[PDB]
Design a protein around this ligand. Structure first.
Ligand SMILES: [K+]
Ligand SMILES: [K+]
Ligand SMILES: [Mn+2]
Ligand SMILES: [Mn+2]
Ligand SMILES: [Mn+2]
Ligand SMILES: [Mn+2]
Lengths: 199, 199, 199, 199
């Protein structure tokens, strides 16, 4: 199929001052681009191995596939979760679900911040939808392990806590980044993803 | 391409009294048969996901692929590593490599037994060949993780320490099984695998 | 402080025909006994390493501590989760929570069975209580990884799917064991653990 | 015992232009300092749990202990592995061992670079000594998992490939960092660590 790097839905500087333009440009044009390129190389090798019945080769390719495939999945969602027009609080049924499942919007922010701050090493914090239980759920994922492929939860909002997501601007202080990012959450997109889950 | 269950190269009772016939029949005709069938099912699902560029589906299939594919890889080697004509010590260049890399055959036996006894949960102990270093090497693998796909070492001799490999006969006493298995190691096969590495 | 092997609260043959006496005696008097003894050995080594500030030694002991400590935690709960007086359905608030969180008791049984059947290698299926969300939750754990220590969920009902839990009687057919075990679930104990959570 | 942040054996700018002073200052005074502080907090909680026989609490503390304890172990070695007076090639028996085990010094550099470049996510590349085999060995470790505590190999030379080790200067281009770091390897320290392994 040949995966492609999706265009960013805004200018690299559109999320300033919360995420600076240098980070956005590196994150999209270098990090995400590399995931796409390496995913395409890995998928081609997997097709060769499947055609030959080389199970050893398939298994040896799994780390690169999950890492670059997961990186592509996660970053593709991440870009749509952010917006220069973002921030504030969601409305409608998503806000109702947040209050129901987490108590309040403020308590939800505390819980998702805590999950994202708690990642040791590289990883992601997620607000997801549990289809079987029919409610929201917070989870963390290591490295580039993607939410749906590894947990079954449908991703609604992801917070990248790899050092490349914040280090140039916030250095070691991940909590300052986690506080800033709330100003650019695209609740319109998160709402669209949530509504798609229900019926 | 479709993987197939290899026939056992000897009678189910050929390894008695070291591994009883009930274990051999269950291990081959039930456990390995399930791995092969589930591998073919997983590979077909992966081919579909690859054709659609569904990376989430590919990643969700990785555990089943490594588990069932590794199960097929490991057990296919295992049956050839055992023989009613086995036991004793290897000869020729394999024996020389064992003495060179481990000090003696007895010291090698201690190291492979220790790796196999040390597995917590299900897994395998392996004598492998390190192609880059050009020498033998011992490693342990969890569950059905196969040696070459996860470490790059070429498998020479594998010891299955899943409970289904010994429990009916030896119950919880894994060391009794490890002591018995040395009497049925097919050093002719281990030598063939070793000589193929040095080509 | 020294951990001790709890006596089984019933006869080794009390769960027949669902779990035979040979399994119960081996499972308790051999498998659990080894976990307790190895836990005490590991804890003593950890106390020495902590006193010396030997972080390398502490980290090297982590696998044995989680394996044997988890083994002790899990099996101590497991014996109380089973009873000759078991089977049937729970009553009162636990039944209400099951219907509320899973739809029905039968749907809950399907979800916990699926989690337990889905374990690849050794592990456990759990019904737990999520304190932060205030509701029930199903999770699976690998090897002897204990539920609360690794997920934060409070354990209510655990299903051991290590091969030593069923192999002598059910051989490779784990689903037959899972079908049988429902006849001996001690819902009185599961209810007590649940009520302690809502205090 | 109360672990302490070791003084750096040189000025924060002593490794320029290969690793800039801002990185060295953040890496030591923020990242390593945090590992030490969090290690001390975690060890105190572990002492409490050991005194109470709370195995659940001990296991829940394992991730923080390995992460911060491993971070302390790894960075303490890393600082001594570098020097403004470094670079070039080792001499004496260490050089003899490198030629013997890897073919040449240049081939060793290629192998350690490849292991360090190959880390997906956060981690480390290591040249270690295998006491049982009596020879050098290259390995990679994820996150802050320390070499000796998780593999048994004695650390000789470590290459930190966490993004915070290079990102401010080299951005996403880890290979440029891996090339530059060879100019500051303190082969006198690596030789001391190697000689300590033999007899
Ligand atoms: K016979
Ligand atoms: K009875
Ligand atoms: Mn990222
Ligand atoms: Mn097996
Ligand atoms: Mn058990
Ligand atoms: Mn570092």
């Amino acid at each position: 199929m040949k995966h492609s790097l999706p265009d960013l839905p805004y200018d690299y500087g559109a999320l300033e001052p919360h995420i600076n333009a240098q980070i956005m440009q590196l994150h999209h044009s270098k990090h995400h681009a590399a995931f796409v390129n390496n995913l395409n190389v890995t998928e081609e090798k997997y097709q060769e191995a499947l055609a030959k019945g080389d199970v050893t080769a398939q298994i040896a390719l799994q780390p690169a596939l999950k890492f670059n495939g997961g990186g592509h999945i996660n970053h593709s969602i991440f870009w749509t979760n952010l917006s220069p027009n973002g921030g504030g609080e969601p409305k409608g049924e998503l806000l109702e679900a947040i209050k129901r499942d987490f108590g309040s919007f403020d308590k939800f922010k505390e819980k998702l911040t805590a999950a994202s701050v708690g990642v040791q090493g590289s990883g992601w914090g997620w607000l997801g939808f549990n289809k079987e239980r029919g409610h929201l759920q917070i989870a963390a994922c290591p490295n580039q392990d993607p939410l749906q492929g590894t947990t079954g939860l449908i991703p609604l909002l992801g917070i990248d806590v790899w050092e490349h997501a914040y280090y140039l601007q916030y250095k070691n202080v991940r909590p300052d980044y986690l506080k800033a990012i709330w100003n650019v959450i695209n609740w319109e997109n998160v709402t669209e993803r949530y509504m798609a889950c229900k019926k």
